[PDB]
Write a protein that binds this ligand. Structure first.
Ligand code: HEM
Ligand SMILES: CC1(C)C[C@H]2C[C@@H](C(=O)O)[C@@H]3COC(=O)[C@]4(CO4)[C@]23C1
Length: 397
């Protein structure tokens, strides 16, 4: 009898921690310790997918005196309209109503074309340079920040201003750094909303300003833009790094994709499903029970914290045969959980898929000999950031 304690050790730089796979083998749900409060950990695909669609399980904390959070997590939860359990239903509903139509088929079609040319240009610069090159700096970081510049209608050079702000806002190890960085994000976005009020374009804030004959306050609009800025590039950067690392580990699938870029959508779904870094703390979706819920033979009581392990569920042999294997030839694979599911299903997921598809359509066709210039074990996953990630990916080609 030994209460398991999150985060679990991972001897590899990717994948799921052995202890979490061991718990998954025993059953769908276990009581675990964490850095803060104890929580129920749900590790099997069927139960994680079910609980994500259960409206009794919500982001907001209903408890009368809530456990303390890092500044980073508090900012995250506020950007997701989960900071007040009494107003979360109306506020979260409004958030999704206002953001979903910003990712229209018209906008996505136009952005796919620009994304494709941009990747072409990024790879031509990469191919013209002398190895070793940091693939994270010159490819992974550059495409998703370009996309956010396009969404917000700002010059591309602005990403050199905001490109580290998600990392800094979400630094759980330094409350003061987190708050100072979020203040910069806020100041920037308020500047931007004031400009878009007199100089609109074909971009997200201009559409928010025009919404409901202009009924939204500057604070309301900047909130929504901050969510786009802070959720809209960093996680995608990390998936380009993880997808590259995964394809480097699987040369047969990599050669298949290089030969047939029509496999890129399938590859991207495998990358999302298998792409978990380090101790994988970002592959947990946190919730609180707002009513009692029975999971198998376990009773989750109102007020309990629940960690929905989307990473472990995406590796679950019960949902994906040979769940640990990268196989872009899977026939009708189940929908992975990397974007979540239910009420908070990732608003940007179609755009993120467009970005990743454009990259991996091209990468190994344009640079067939691309490979790591350093050992895998020297790559350092950044555990203190809510979004994790690697700081550099040195390559040769
Ligand atoms: C590969 C890249 C991405 C991954 C893996 C990812 C993953 C996720 C996940 C798992 C959630 C649900 C969190 C929860 O249920 O607590 C989420 C929510 C969200 N995502 Fe994404 N995301 C990605 C990219 C993006 C992009 C590109 C955008 C927009 C430009 C975006 C905007 C959002 C927003 C606004 C939410 C909040 C939805 C809500 O709370 O209702 N994300 N994302
Ligand atoms: C709004 C988010 C940025 C979306 C998810 C992406 C995930 C990641 O970075 O992989 C990040 C980590 O922390 C979480 O609570 C997650 C899992 O819900 C998120 C929060």
């Amino acid at each position: 009898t030994d209460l398991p304690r999150l985060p679990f050790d991972n001897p590899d730089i990717m994948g799921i921690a052995p202890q979490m796979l061991a718990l998954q083998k025993e059953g769908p749900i276990a009581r675990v310790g964490t850095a803060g409060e104890d929580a129920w950990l749900v590790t099997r695909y069927d139960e994680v997918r079910t609980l994500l669609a259960d409206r009794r399980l919500r982001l907001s904390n209903p408890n009368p005196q809530p456990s303390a959070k890092s500044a980073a997590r508090a900012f995250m939860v506020a950007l997701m309209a989960g900071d007040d359990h009494e107003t979360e239903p109306a506020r979260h509903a409004q958030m999704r109503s206002l953001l979903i139509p910003r990712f229209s088929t018209r906008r996505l079609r136009l952005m796919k074309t620009r994304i494709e040319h941009h990747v072409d240009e990024l790879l031509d610069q990469l191919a013209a340079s002398a190895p070793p090159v940091d693939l994270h700096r010159v490819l992974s970081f550059r495409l998703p920040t370009m996309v956010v510049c396009d969404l917000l209608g700002v010059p591309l050079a602005d990403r050199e201003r905001f490109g580290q702000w998600a990392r800094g806002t979400f630094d759980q190890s330094d409350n003061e750094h987190s708050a100072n960085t979020f203040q910069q994000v806020v100041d920037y976005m308020l500047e931007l909303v004031a400009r878009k009020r007199v100089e609109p374009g074909d971009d997200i804030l201009s559409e928010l300003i025009a919404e409901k004959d202009g009924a939204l306050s500057d604070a309301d609009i900047a909130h929504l833009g901050n969510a786009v800025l802070l959720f809209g590039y960093e996680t995608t950067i990390v998936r380009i790094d993880l997808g590259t690392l995964l394809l480097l580990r699987n040369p047969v699938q990599r050669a298949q994709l290089a030969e047939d870029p029509g496999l890129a959508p399938a590859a991207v779904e495998e990358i999302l499903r298998l792409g978990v870094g380090g101790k994988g703390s970002n592959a947990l979706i946190p919730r609180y029970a707002h009513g009692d819920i029975t999971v198998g033979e376990t009773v989750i009581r109102t007020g309990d914290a629940v960690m929905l392990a989307i990473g472990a569920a995406n590796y679950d042999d019960r949902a994906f045969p040979d769940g640990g294997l990268f196989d872009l030839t899977r026939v009708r694979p189940r929908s992975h959980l990397a974007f979540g599911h239910g009420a908070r299903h990732c608003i940007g997921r179609t755009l993120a898929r467009i970005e990743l598809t454009a990259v991996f359509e091209r990468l190994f066709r344009r640079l067939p000999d691309l490979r790591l210039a350093v050992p895998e074990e020297s790559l350092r996953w950044q555990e203190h950031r809510i979004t994790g990630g690697f700081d550099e990916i040195p390559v040769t080609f």
